Amino acid sequence: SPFYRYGMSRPGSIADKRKNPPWSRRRPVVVEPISDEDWHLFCGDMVEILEGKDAGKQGKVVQVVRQRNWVVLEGLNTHYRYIGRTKDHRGTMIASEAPLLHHQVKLVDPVDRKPTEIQWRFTEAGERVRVSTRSGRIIPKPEFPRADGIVPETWTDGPKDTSVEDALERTYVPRLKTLEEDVMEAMGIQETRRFKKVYWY
Amino acid sequence: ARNVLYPLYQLGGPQLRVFRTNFFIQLVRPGTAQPEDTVQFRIPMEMTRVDLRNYLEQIYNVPVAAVRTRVQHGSNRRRDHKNVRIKKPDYKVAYVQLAHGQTFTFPDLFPEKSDLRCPGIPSWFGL
């Protein structure tokens, strides 16, 4: 919709329905459009705060709202709020991180702790990789847990789950027969009648 | 099957087979009180009572003795923030009476099973 503001809560949660009612007509946010190729910030990448309350402190990206050009760092640019407040109890005070725009942070050289600018460039194999503008070097994509939280390697086979080998098994035989014709032959159904002529129009 | 073409049938035509079916049905707890054999289903509006008998007997291996259906009108009275009526989708309710004396009842899913004397002065202070 033309009037929809992206915030910090993951879309579709109770918070995002409360913030953005259908009748909301808040002033649009103006965001410098950034090409998919241009963007170089990914979850798990260590970055340094160029300016702000925690300027000069390095942190780890834990969330990226590309709709707002936001990068959220753990334990930095952090203000305070009460979580779990109830009528009976005040709640628990916690420190909540605030979003940072990309230009307010920079990526870090993998070997040395410095805010080295990077450029996108291909490799011998052809895979796209970020390369530092100075001290040209390959910064690997940081492995991060998936948002759904499912861990592949530790996942254990259970009922209603196919085995890995069974899924990999291939039995398709290329043949000029439809599914409607393979099933009957396999299942042994026999039909000798044929449909009468139909005048399509 | 729904939203698909059924071949026109003329005298001497073959039997119609639907190998993969678009009709998906859900069993509901009765709103009213129903006989032990009777079972309620919510089914796609294009499904016929004949299809449900075939649908349950073959896919689910359930013996069916009778099927009765009705079309439920959804409300169109609620208006949204723009004052536009919202229509609740109309659905088809099917009543299936089991055979051979078989009995069924909906299972019960979800078996779930300070200092008055010192008022308002912070107690953190030791002084």
């Binding site: 009612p21 909301s24 | 208006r79 923030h81 004052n83």
Partner: peptide, 15 residues
């Protein structure tokens, strides 16, 4: 005499 009226808009104010 003439006649014209206005609607009582639902006006949900919960922002």
């Amino acid at each position: 005499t003439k006649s014209r009226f206005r609607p009582p808009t639902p006006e949900p104010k919960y922002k």
